[PDB]
Design a protein around this ligand. Structure first.
Ligand SMILES: CCCCCCCCCCCCCCCCCC(=O)OC[C@H](CO[C@@H]1O[C@H](CO[C@H]2O[C@H](CO)[C@H](O)[C@H](O)[C@H]2O)[C@H](O)[C@H](O)[C@H]1O)OC(=O)CCCCCCCCCCCCCCCCC
Ligand SMILES: CCCCCCCCCCCCCCCCCC(=O)OC[C@H](CO[C@@H]1O[C@H](CO[C@H]2O[C@H](CO)[C@H](O)[C@H](O)[C@H]2O)[C@H](O)[C@H](O)[C@H]1O)OC(=O)CCCCCCCCCCCCCCCCC
Ligand code: CLA
Ligand code: CLA
Ligand code: CLA
Ligand code: CLA
Ligand code: CLA
Ligand SMILES: CCCCCCCCCCCCCCCC(=O)OC[C@H](CO[C@@H]1O[C@H](CS(=O)(=O)O)[C@@H](O)[C@H](O)[C@H]1O)OC(=O)CCCCCCCCCCCCCCC
Ligand SMILES: CC1=C(/C=C/C(C)=C/C=C/C(C)=C/C=C/C=C(C)/C=C/C=C(C)/C=C/C2=C(C)CCCC2(C)C)C(C)(C)CCC1
Ligand SMILES: CC1=C(/C=C/C(C)=C/C=C/C(C)=C/C=C/C=C(C)/C=C/C=C(C)/C=C/C2=C(C)CCCC2(C)C)C(C)(C)CCC1
Ligand SMILES: CC1=C(/C=C/C(C)=C/C=C/C(C)=C/C=C/C=C(C)/C=C/C=C(C)/C=C/C2=C(C)CCCC2(C)C)C(C)(C)CCC1
Ligand SMILES: [Cl-]
Ligand SMILES: [Cl-]
Ligand SMILES: [Fe+2]
Lengths: 442, 137, 341, 34, 36, 334, 82
């Protein structure tokens, strides 16, 4: 009974056509990953940092350790070409199976074959499909471990000497560390799982998730839902979609904050500096400049009475002054050599800042993630000249938007699933209006 | 008003000799300045040391005087502090340091002249806005 | 049945676009106001009135083109094409800003024509004329912003210019110079506009989620017949819902729809009044008690004092380019600036 | 059996004819160089 | 402050537990038409 | 009939004058906490060092404010995004100086309002209604999340979240324009179309239905008494309303399906306000409004100002004055 | 539910419609183009070309500053470009 504008809802109970809708749509994702990567490569100039060039996929490949060497410099673009081509090619096969199943194949599957066929209300069949996909995801997570440990490693921004591709020989398995992240507060200085700052924890957490997903996949193949679950949930295709919509929404918000704060699995070398990073780099820049001119940055009182260059955080740590006081939770490979037990060390500052640190701070201050929609870099009052918007802003904003609409979609489809399941999603029965059989409130 | 040869005529050296850039050179230098320099010197200021700008009068007072094509081309190969007392290739883009500043790698001798020319022409067009900062935006 | 009635007959024939006697006023004036805006934004500069480019021809985009106001030196001239300023010369007329008065004045008679059309069609069809009444609020806003405001000031120059970013500038001018956010008549208009949008959304959603099931399709739109006598949604269930969610609810569908007229219409009427005050610089700019305390006590600070520093910023930084006819020359050293910036 | 020229006909072309003209004028503008 | 922190921890846990268990107590069935 | 099932039966009861529900179980306390703290702070809270520079801003009535200037002031910049509950302060005195109450209020409020949304789903299910009123309310809810949570997260401090007060709101929106050019951002422009259009369509709908009320009363009575709560017949003639509005414009610009009309009424402002909430939420990550500063230049290279350059001049005055003591370095990067 | 004019959908799917309008539509577009490509738009409306906002060594706006001498003021600025 659906209109053309809700036309895909006509697929709910056509398992064979719905399968083609999904596989064709997976062809589109793979196509984009392939075409986008080749577009980025055709446009790539290796002399410029990736983050001046509008690149979001090449940084994901570099981060996996392909095509880069010490300091993030691109050494070989061929792995980029390969990743693009293979994805591009594979979308043709997904395209082929998707259109075949949507147009030509059996409209429904449950007559053609009892294994591929499914009823949404079949809780056993449904948990088995879930179990298969869990196992798949577990394999996926273990492929990242395979790459880090046995096939060349990953890019490590924290490596000695400016960052480098490093093999991960001792992943963290201690569950107090791995699961300790899940229990960290999301507020400032803690940052939940976004605070993961080394590849050992990254790789070990994926060992864990791969095992847990395979464990759980086998569990759901072998069981059916307990009655407490049977009574808490709505068991319908739209209900299942709504559960996934909330999940992806949650995941999108998390990813938004990941690319905005994390400079470990989003190296600043490739993605540009974080907001916090750039703001810290500015204070560093003028600390360096003024001290070279003779200023004693430790003892310089600023207008407010707080230190002009340096001050204390609320728990005592020596931190950069000015408005960047808010960003003192920032940690970065260019800054950490200056940190002592009490925060920034005045003796290291006076004596041990290196040109590469001066360069890096200057670079990151001038590539802060601020810019206009038409890609003029800088604060909104800046004149045209610099064509730049940080990859971090592009990735953060887009995924905030998608996460928001998917929470809307969740609410839409969860409420409709509930109401369709109880039988009043098309409206109120005039002859059996519930409120007319209730007592009035007053 | 237009981009006449008089505004495209700038000092070549300190002896007083002049060179007359072309419109092609001026526009190519503007694009190269944006490519390699504007992230710090948008509008003729210096975001990481605002006490030093690209105003002609400031360049004139640098040691090595830099208000001419030559001084600028030399600055792009071997930058010094404003009094010329120390070389700063390792914290300032230059051909001498194109290993650590890779955008300087693919710049040719003629590109240097074009960048130098744009820097010398632009205050003649924009006046005080060049190197003046936000007061004049 | 003479010529007047025969013409009445023809003006009021049922055709795809109803004309009527109000059509004689409405159609030329609406077409000329609209065509003047499109002509000026495509082709005409503001170089001689404002020192600004303002047309597609000059390099502007949809957000920055405008038909800008005349030069302050024109005062409140009507700027007739045949008047003493342009003296019949079309080109000079455009360069002196004559298309601004052209659009404003034809717009004003256009709005009159539109409201007369609302009266005319309501009388012919046999309905009460509340849509015409409600349209009084758009009219009040237009005449108070586009005519009264500049007539109490020095010239048309300070009316809004007809463009997207030109209007954005007008908003910011009112903050820095009139402190218009602090004005209670604006605050009432803000509550009227935001109040209307809430009412709009909440009523539409409520109807759509209290529908009776009157068809079998999953598209509930088909189950409505415009000639059916029965309500299409349950006021009773809607009332219970909101009584239990919010505490109170509508119970009278006539009051409900009257209230939806009343709220945004009253809001706009209120903001118009405040703008009439700003025509005379009769602002709600300061709280005296605040200023007395702050002058005496340098440790007293509020969001009120903080916002006046921002105003002072806006004034000194925008005035020389926004009022070029005043030849404001502010040396660097006199501009108000906080530390570093 | 319809009329061709109507009050509707006029209102349409009163708008549509200047539109196409202005669109051509604005298209040309994208090729103006300073 | 520790007394307070403790109190609040206990109050929140209590209300969160009420919430989770409330919705696990056959909430789909609490509607006016089809209860199951 | 055991103790627990009776509590469950009262929680979800449709007979309660105010519906509680499982969402209400979280909503009622968090809203009471935020409300009580707000009222007390607005009246009597001492001055707060919002920007971390030991320059406290007086927000409350007893410290020299009126209704218009009063606010509960955002928490200190020194705190940034750190969690600052009462039990983390050495004393209430310290908690009050650093803006502790703001955090307590905005967190309890965002929670309770989120549960308010779900409460709207929940009672719709208990009543046999369709479920999407809560979707309409997610547009305002998302707008409050944007100004109290998302914008602080992206700029790194709750001191840049929106203050809880009239004049503090204006301060927030002036500073926002200077730093993001929100007026030149298309998602804010869609918000204006959403709220201007929603005010329009509110007045239109209200005037069209009021215009076509069926005569049921005398001229001495309010017309409103011609409708009786729960009558089955519609109270106005929609075909007359269509006949008027279709002639005011033309036939096909007028609805004659009341279902599509009211869906349109619901969708226009909801979608417009989703976009403006997404505007704030994405400017939180500094993807700012269009920048056409110096975009037009003449044959020689002179800048030719447009209205956007004039906008920029005003934005500069706001930039250079805001938080006038709180910047030591020449770029205000957050 | 109609007032007697021919339905739009019937007109625009008609061969005669498209025989006429495949000429009129591109001709008007071309007309509008020529209005700009020839320069006429500048002279008609009085809009500065990119080389005639300022005189060569001039950075002052030619602002009208007189109400009844405005016409002549503009003309005086324009002659200062020759
Ligand atoms: C079931 C239903 C849900 C019930 C949950 C109820 C409680 C939820 C609490 C959520 C609110 C948390 C706010 C996050 C605050 C903030 O600081 O959030 C950011 C944190 C990250 O924290 C930052 O994490 C950083 C991690 O980086 C550190 O480590 C890095 C390592 O590379 C770098 O070195 C970096 O320099 C260094 O600082 C630092 O710790 C910062 O100090 C710290 O601020 O993100 C996070 O925890 C990641 C996820 C946060 C997502 C929150 C988004 C809010 C979405 C609201 C959507 C509303 C939509 C509208 C509804 C209608
Ligand atoms: C409601 C429904 C709305 C539907 C209405 C439809 C729209 C109709 C269009 C109306 C056209 C309005 C024309 C107004 C022109 C105007 O005012 O033009 C202004 C002139 C006065 O001219 C001004 O006069 C000023 C003062 O001059 C005097 O003072 C100077 C100072 O020394 C010198 O001495 C000078 O010689 C001397 O004349 C300056 O010279 C200004 O530059 C000059 O423009 O008045 C005159 O035309 C007329 C003045 C008397 C008429 C008063 C009626 C005006 C209506 C607006 C009233 C609102 C009042 C606003 C107050 C808030
Ligand atoms: C995994 C994601 C997913 C999936 C599979 C579905 C699946 C479904 N949805 Mg749900 N939905 C989702 C996410 C999802 N939705 C999200 C995120 C939202 C919030 C916005 C919604 C909101 C929503 C509503 C409001 C409704 C559905 C409906 C439906 C059903 C019919 C859909 C249809 O035919 O659309 C047909 C497709 C179109 C009409 C095209 C839409 C065009 C979009 C809006 C424009 C997007 C363009 C983008 C912005 C880029 C612009 C660039 C330009 C060049 C185009 C179907 C079961 C309907 C329903 O309840 O059925 C039961 C229904 O009424 N959905
Ligand atoms: C979803 C994730 C995502 C993200 C973060 C980006 C981000 C970026 N892209 Mg990619 N892109 C994407 C998806 C994405 N794109 C898709 C799906 C396509 C296929 C159409 C492309 C095709 C594409 C091309 C062809 C190019 C980019 C380029 C760019 C850069 C400039 C963007 C710009 O100016 O936009 C301008 C802003 C807009 C267009 C705003 C759109 C707003 C929409 C309509 C609202 C959404 C409503 C709902 C969904 C930036 C790094 C450019 C670049 O630098 O390449 C190196 C470039 O040339 N992108
Ligand atoms: C990713 C997007 C997507 C996908 C995969 C689908 C998929 C599908 N839709 Mg939905 N739909 C979508 C978006 C999508 N839709 C949108 C945006 C709208 C709003 C306009 C709708 C509205 C809609 C309606 C109203 C209906 C569907 C229906 C269907 C199904 C049958 C369609 C059919 O018979 O085609 C027939 C069409 C053709 C034969 C035309 C040719 C189409 C081909 C496949 C184009 C692709 C060419 C491509 C380049 C091939 C490459 C070749 C290579 C792989 C070898 C199919 C599974 C129908 C359904 O549910 O059936 C019960 C149905 O009634 N859809
Ligand atoms: C998850 C997606 C999916 C699912 C569930 C199905 C399910 C089905 N398909 Mg479709 N199909 C798909 C994708 C999918 N197919 C794709 C991508 C293509 C394009 C190549 C096709 C092309 C296709 C055709 C042409 C036909 C089917 C048919 C069938 C049915 C019988 C399959 C069978 O017995 O093979 C059993 C399994 C095998 C014979 C071999 C499986 C070994 C595979 C190839 C290796 C594993 C791949 C790996 C896990 C992932 C890819 C690797 C990559 C990451 C590099 C069944 C309903 C038949 C049908 O419906 O006829 C009525 C039929 O004729 N399918
Ligand atoms: C995509 C992943 C996925 C999905 C959809 C499901 C789905 C399901 N599982 Mg399976 N499961 C999975 C992965 C998945 N599982 C994996 C990987 C494992 C191995 C660890 C399991 C192990 C497992 C067991 C052991 C059982 C299920 C059961 C169930 C059913 C009830 C779920 C339920 O009530 O959750 C709703 C969640 C709760 C009621 C508890 C809430 C507690 C959470 C953690 C609170 C945290 C909230 C917070 C905001 C999140 C932040 C992070 C947090 C750690 C702090 C349902 C069909 C049950 C069943 O019927 O089995 C047949 C069951 O007993 N699952
Ligand atoms: C320098 C000053 C310049 C400005 C001068 C302003 C004056 C211009 C006034 C323009 C008036 C426009 C009326 C158009 C008349 C028309 O073409 O239709 C009349 C023809 C016949 O149309 C008929 O159409 C009729 C329907 S209807 O009237 O068009 O609605 C139908 O009844 C009939 O059969 C059919 O033949
Ligand atoms: C169902 C349907 C639908 C959908 C569809 C789909 C979604 C599809 C897809 C499909 C797909 C998804 C496709 C794909 C394709 C692809 C391909 C076909 C590829 C190819 C490739 C190539 C050829 C390559 C080449 C190369 C190389 C190799 C190297 C380098 C160079 C180059 C690149 C050239 C629609 C909506 C329409 C409608 C309804 C129905
Ligand atoms: C990889 C990695 C890692 C790790 C991680 C992990 C280990 C994670 C996990 C995670 C997890 C472990 C998660 C969990 C989650 C859960 C959730 C998400 C939940 C949900 C829930 C819900 C949703 C419910 C609901 C309900 C209720 C409450 C009541 C009744 C009804 C219902 C059922 C509906 C780390 C960080 C180290 C690092 C990096 C990498
Ligand atoms: C002023 C004047 C006059 C008049 C004139 C006229 C009346 C004009 C008209 C004109 C016109 C009448 C014009 C038109 C134009 C138009 C246009 C220019 C359009 C455009 C549009 C567009 C561009 C659109 C597009 C789009 C988009 C964008 C999105 C969506 C889709 C669419 C398609 C909508 C006269 C002679 C008396 C003389 C005096 C002066
Ligand atoms: Cl401020
Ligand atoms: Cl600072
Ligand atoms: Fe209504």
């Amino acid at each position: 009974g659906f209109a053309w504008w809700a036309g895909n809802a006509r697929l709910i109970n056509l398992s064979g056509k719905l399968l083609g809708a999904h596989v064709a749509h997976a062809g589109l994702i793979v196509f984009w990953a392939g075409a986008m990567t080749l577009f980025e490569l055709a446009h790539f100039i290796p002399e410029k940092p990736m983050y001046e060039q509008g690149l979001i996929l090449i940084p994901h490949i570099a981060t996996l350790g392909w095509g880069v060497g010490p300091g993030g410099e691109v050494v070989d673009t061929f792995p980029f070409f390969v990743v693009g081509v293979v994805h591009l090619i594979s979308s043709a096969v997904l395209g082929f199976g998707g259109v075949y199943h949507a147009i030509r194949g059996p409209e429904t599957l449950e007559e053609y074959s009892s294994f591929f066929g499914y009823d949404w209300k079949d809780k056993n069949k449904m948990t088995t499909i879930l179990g298969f996909h869990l196992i798949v995801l577990g394999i996926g997570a273990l492929l990242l471990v395979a790459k880090a440990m046995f096939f060349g490693g990953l890019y490590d921004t924290w490596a000695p000497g400016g960052g480098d591709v490093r093999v991960i020989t001792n992943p963290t398995l201690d569950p107090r560390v791995i699961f300790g992240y899940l229990l960290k507060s999301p507020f400032g200085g803690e940052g939940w799982i976004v605070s993961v700052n080394n590849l050992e924890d990254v790789v070990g957490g994926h060992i864990w998730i791969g095992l847990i997903c395979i464990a759980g996949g086998i569990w759901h193949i072998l069981t059916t839902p307990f009655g407490w679950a049977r009574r808490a949930f709505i068991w319908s295709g739209e209900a299942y979609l709504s559960y996934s919509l909330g999940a992806l929404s949650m995941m999108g918000f998390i990813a938004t904050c990941f690319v905005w704060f994390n400079n470990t699995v989003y190296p600043s070398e490739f993605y540009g500096p974080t907001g916090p990073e750039a703001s810290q780099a500015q204070a560093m820049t003028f600390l360096i400049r003024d001290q070279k001119l003779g200023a004693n940055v430790g003892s310089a009182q600023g207008p407010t009475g707080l230190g002009k260059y340096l001050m204390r955080s609320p728990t005592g740590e020596i931190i950069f002054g000015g408005e960047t006081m808010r960003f003192w939770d920032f940690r970065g490979p260019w800054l950490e050599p200056l940190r002592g037990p009490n925060g920034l060390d005045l003796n290291k500052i006076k004596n041990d800042i290196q040109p590469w640190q001066e360069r890096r701070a200057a670079e990151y201050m001038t590539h802060a993630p601020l810019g206009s929609l038409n890609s003029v870099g800088g604060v909104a009052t800046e004149i045209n000249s610099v064509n730049f918007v940080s990859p971090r802003s592009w990735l953060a904003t887009s995924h905030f938007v998608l996460a928001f609409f998917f929470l809307v979609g969740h609410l839409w489809h969860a409420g409709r699933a509930r109401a369709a399941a109880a039988g009043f999603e098309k409206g109120i029965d005039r002859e059996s209006e519930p409120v007319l059989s209730m007592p009035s409130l007053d | 008003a237009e981009l006449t040869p008089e505004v495209l005529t700038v000092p070549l050296n300190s002896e007083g000799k002049t060179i007359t850039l072309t419109e092609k050179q001026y526009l190519e230098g503007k694009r190269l300045f944006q490519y390699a320099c504007a992230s710090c010197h948008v509008g003729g200021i210096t975001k990481t040391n605002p006490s030093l700008d690209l105003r002609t009068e400031t360049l004139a007072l640098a040691t090595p005087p830099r208000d001419n094509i030559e001084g600028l081309v030399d600055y792009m190969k071997n930058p010094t502090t404003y009094d010329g007392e120390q070389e700063i290739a390792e914290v300032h883009p230059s051909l001498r340091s194109a290993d650590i500043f890779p955008k300087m790698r693919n710049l040719t001798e003629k590109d240097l002249v074009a960048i130098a020319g744009h820097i010398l022409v632009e205050p003649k067009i924009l006046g005080d806005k060049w190197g003046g900062g936000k007061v004049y935006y | 049945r003479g010529w007047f009635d025969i013409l009445d007959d023809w003006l009021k024939r049922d055709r795809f676009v109803f004309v009527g006697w109000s059509g004689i006023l409405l159609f030329p004036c609406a077409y000329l106001a609209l065509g003047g805006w499109l002509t000026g934004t495509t082709f005409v500069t503001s170089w001689y009135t404002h020192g600004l480019a303002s047309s597609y021809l000059e390099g502007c985009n949809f957000l920055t083109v405008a038909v800008s106001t005349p030069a302050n030196s024109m005062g409140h001239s009507l700027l007739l094409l045949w008047g003493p300023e342009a003296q019949g010369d079309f080109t000079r007329w455009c360069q002196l800003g004559g298309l601004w008065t052209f659009i404003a004045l034809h717009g004003a008679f256009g709005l009159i024509g539109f409201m007369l059309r609302q009266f005319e069609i309501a009388r012919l069809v046999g309905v009460r004329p509340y849509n015409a009444i409600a349209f009084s609020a758009p009219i009040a806003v237009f005449v108070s912003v586009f005519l009264i405001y500049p007539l109490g000031q020095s010239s048309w120059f300070f009316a809004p210019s007809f463009g997207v970013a030109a209007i954005f500038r007008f908003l910011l001018f009112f903050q820095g110079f009139h402190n218009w956010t602090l004005n209670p008549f604006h605050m009432m208009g803000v509550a009227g506009v935001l109040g209307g949008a809430l009412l709009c959304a909440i009523h539409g959603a409520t109807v759509e989620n209290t529908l009776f099931q009157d068809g079998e399709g999953a598209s509930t739109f088909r189950a409505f017949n415009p000639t059916q006598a029965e309500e299409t949604y349950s006021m009773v269930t809607a009332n219970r819902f909101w009584s239990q969610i919010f505490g109170i609810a509508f119970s009278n569908k006539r009051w409900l729809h009257f209230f939806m007229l009343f709220v945004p219409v009253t809001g706009l009427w209120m903001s118009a009044i405040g703008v009439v005050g700003l025509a005379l610089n009769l602002r709600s700019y300061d709280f005296i008690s605040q200023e007395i305390r702050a002058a005496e006590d340098p440790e007293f600070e509020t969001f009120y004092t903080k916002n006046l520093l921002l105003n002072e910023g806006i004034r000194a930084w925008m005035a020389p380019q926004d009022q070029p006819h005043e030849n404001f020359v502010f040396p660097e050293e006199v501009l108000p600036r906080g530390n570093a910036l | 059996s319809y009329p061709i020229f109507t009050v509707r006909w006029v209102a349409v072309h009163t708008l549509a004819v200047p539109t196409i003209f202005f669109l051509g004028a604005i298209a040309a503008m994208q090729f103006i160089q300073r | 402050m520790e007394t307070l922190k403790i109190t609040v921890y206990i109050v929140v846990t209590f209300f969160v537990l009420l919430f989770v268990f409330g919705f696990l107590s056959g909430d789909p069935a609490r509607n006016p038409k089809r209860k199951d | 009939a055991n103790l627990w099932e009776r509590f469950c039966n009262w929680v979800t009861s449709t007979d309660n004058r105010l519906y509680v529900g499982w969402f209400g179980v979280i909503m009622i306390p968090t809203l009471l906490a935020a409300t009580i703290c707000f009222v007390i702070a607005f009246i009597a809270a001492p001055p707060v060092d919002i920007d971390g520079i030991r320059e406290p801003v007086s927000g409350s009535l007893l410290y020299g404010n009126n209704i218009i200037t009063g606010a509960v002031v955002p928490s200190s910049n020194a705190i940034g995004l750190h969690f600052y509950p009462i039990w983390e302060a050495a004393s209430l005195d310290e908690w009050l100086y650093n803006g502790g109450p703001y955090q307590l209020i905005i967190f309890h409020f965002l929670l309770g309002a989120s549960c308010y949304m779900g409460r709207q789903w929940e009672l719709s299910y208990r009543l046999g209604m369709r479920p999407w009123i809560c979707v309409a309310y997610s547009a305002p809810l998302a707008s409050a999340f944007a100004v109290f949570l998302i914008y602080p997260i992206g700029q790194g401090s709750f001191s840049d979240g929106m203050p809880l007060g009239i004049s503090g709101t204006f301060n927030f929106m002036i500073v926002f324009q200077a730093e993001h050019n929100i007026l030149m951002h298309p998602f804010h422009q869609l918000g204006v179309a959403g709220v201007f259009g929603g005010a329009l369509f509110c007045a239109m709908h209200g005037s069209l239905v009021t215009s076509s009320l069926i005569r049921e009363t005398t001229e001495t009575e309010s017309a409103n008494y011609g409708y009786k709560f729960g009558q089955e017949e519609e109270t106005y003639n929609i075909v007359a309303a269509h006949g008027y509005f279709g002639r005011l414009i033309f036939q096909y610009a007028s609805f004659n399906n009341s279902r599509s009309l009211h869906f349109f009424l619901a969708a226009w402002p909801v979608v417009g306000v989703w976009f403006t909430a997404l505007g704030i939420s994405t400017m939180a990550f500094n993807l700012n409004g269009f920048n056409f500063n110096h975009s037009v230049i003449d044959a020689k290279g002179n800048v030719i100002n447009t209205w956007a350059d004039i906008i920029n001049r005003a934005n500069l005055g706001m930039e250079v004055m805001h938080e006038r003591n709180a910047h030591n370095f020449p770029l205000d990067l957050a | 539910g109609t007032t007697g004019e021919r339905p739009f959908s019937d007109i625009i799917t008609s061969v005669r419609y498209w025989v006429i309008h495949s000429i009129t539509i591109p001709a008007l577009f071309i007309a509008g183009w020529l209005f700009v490509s020839t320069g006429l738009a500048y002279d008609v409306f009085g809009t500065p070309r990119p080389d005639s906002y300022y005189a060569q060594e001039q950075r002052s706006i030619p602002l009208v500053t007189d109400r009844f001498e405005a016409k002549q003021q503009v003309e005086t600025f324009l002659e200062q470009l020759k």
